[PDB]
């Protein structure tokens, strides 16, 4: 999802990792 280190859904962005 939203944030930064490593992925969420869309793939090759990344998430602060609550999902």
Do not use: W
């Not at 992925?7 to 990344?14: A, F, H, V, Y």
């Amino acid at each position: 999802g939203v944030g930064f280190g490593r992925p969420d859904s869309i793939l090759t962005q990344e998430q602060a990792k609550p999902m």
